Subunit: 144 residues, 3 copies
């Protein structure tokens, strides 16, 4: 009971910087510790029931397998709302998968589960630049 | 052809207890075998084309990597619609991942794929209480 | 910078064959190389900002863990928009997971990450027929 204990490798505390409610869903923009911004999309019902408002503290939860890693966009613009650039800090290889941890500017760490082939193909290595790509619809929000 | 054969570790048969259609999506509340309830969100087009209605039998499909495990909410309320409490029945550890199976009250079993670090950090062990957290948008529905 | 380098095992180039915008989201129908069709659902804001239009070239990105495999629908109709039938080309087993690659008619290959139990239960083997099941909401789009 000292914290929330959840399996997700990424659990970030932040404050809502903007709340944009439409008739079906609500986009919640969150300012995390390091200055990193993350967007989450939740249902209108959740935005009302969780009592979301700009300035309120929230937790954003993202499972590792939901994070994609990108090293070269090659000019492409993507539909996913969150493209967080950082540097590779840790890689731990498994049998077919691997866990990659990136440090974002400001210090936040984000962890992604990708195939060991992707680590190979992307040329990941401690210090290498990469972006974590996360759809806002794959971010779960929590409110104290 | 004796059943539906799909990779998902979780395939549950149930009856629709409530159908709530909006102009874009439809929330389908499903009563599963053990008395467990699961919510799914599908498009309006799917609710019309599948002929959904309260009282009709459906199958809900959830891939293992889409299920988060939580042991202590610490007072937090989450945006995900499904928080199913149960007890740990089986854990099988892999290289970087692990498969955890929970028994819910009533008997339904739910299987989650998490990192082996999460199993360690959460202190999971046969008999330990935990909740499976599943967004309703990550439940696929099937109709005979 | 010769291509987009992203971890996703499935990155397909295609042309938009239909764009259907509603007040919240937009369904984008994509004709891939082999003649295979894939549907993606993106936000209205993304459809406007990416300048989507029928006839324009796009890339569709799907992470391996987001693809389900099905061998026998047994008559069931599912809520997921993409059901792509193909033949198994490659399986590589890990510790608890496995990577399965299917060849679709026309030549496109799709890769799925499933549990090694699912490979066993489905009786997958090179040449076996199977369908990749992908929600349209789990397809990320990119535009040059």
């Amino acid at each position: 009971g000292s914290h929330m204990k959840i399996s997700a490798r990424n659990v970030f505390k932040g404050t809502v910087s903007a709340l944009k409610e439409g008739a079906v869903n609500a986009e919640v923009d969150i300012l995390l510790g390091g200055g990193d911004k993350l967007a989450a999309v939740v249902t209108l019902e959740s935005a009302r029931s969780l009592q979301l408002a700009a300035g309120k503290e929230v937790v954003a939860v993202v499972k590792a397998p939901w994070v994609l890693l990108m090293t070269d966009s090659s000019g492409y613009r993507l539909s996913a709302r969150n493209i967080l650039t950082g540097t590779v800090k840790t890689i731990e290889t498994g049998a077919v998968n691997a866990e990659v941890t990136l440090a974002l500017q400001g210090g936040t760490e984000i962890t992604s589960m990708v195939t060991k082939e992707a680590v190979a193909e992307l040329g990941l290595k401690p210090g290498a630049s990469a972006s974590a790509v996360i759809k806002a619809s794959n971010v779960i929000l929590g409110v104290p």
